[PDB]
Amino acid sequence: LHKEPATLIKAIDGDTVKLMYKGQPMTFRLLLVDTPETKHPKKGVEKYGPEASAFTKKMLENAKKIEVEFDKGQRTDKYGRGLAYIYADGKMVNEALVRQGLAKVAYVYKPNNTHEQHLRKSEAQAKKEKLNIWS
């Protein structure tokens, strides 16, 4: 696994972001995490949805360097979104969301599961501290 540089274009949701990656605009979906929805009219704005989106936005907007990390499996989903681990100045947004209790560790599909243990460890901590989702 290796990181590649990307440039932010627009944060769309806690778990979905648009980046410029190798000269092309691309929508990225954050691997292994599910943040509460602000979009989908299924229901509307779930609780901590606006909070998760603001966290992702801020972390990405205030960064010096953004990097995308592809996992070992397929690199895009059926909607055409890149599937990756996103890093803001060396810190993984995916993990930070979970550690802050703003995201669940999603259903994991091998072999796209390399940082799974790390994230479930972070989700257990957030559960212990009863943060946001877990309170």
Q: Report the CATH number at residue 96.
A: 2.40.50.90
Residues forming the active site: 29, 37, 81
Q: How determined?
A: X-ray
**Is 38 annotated as ligand-binding?**
no
Concatenated DSSP letters for the chain? --EEEEEEEEE-SSSEEEEEETTEEEEEEETTEEPPPSS-TTTS--TTHHHHHHHHHHHHHT-S-EEEEE-SS-SB-TTS-EEEEEEETTEEHHHHHHHTTS-EEPPP-TTS-TTHHHHHHHHHHHHHTT-GGG-
How many domains, in total, are found in the chain? 1
Going by C-beta distance under 8 Å and a sequence separation of 6 or more, which residues neighbour residue 51? Answer: 36, 102, 132
Residues 6+ apart with CB under 8 A from 40: none
- C-beta neighbour count of 77 within 10 angstroms: 14
Ligand-binding annotation for 34, yes or no, is yes
List the one residue out of 102, 93, 107 whose CA is nearest residue 135. Answer: 102
- The answer to whether 38 and 78 are in contact (CB under 8 A) is no
Spatial separation of the C-alpha atoms in residues 93 and 21, rounded to whole Å: 17
| 31-47 per-residue burial string, b: 16 or more CB within 10 A, e: under 16 | bbbbbbbbeeeeeeebe
Structural domain boundaries enclosing 6? 1-135
Residue 92 C-alpha from the chain's centroid: 8
Q: How many Cα neighbours within 13 Å face the side chain of 133? A: 24
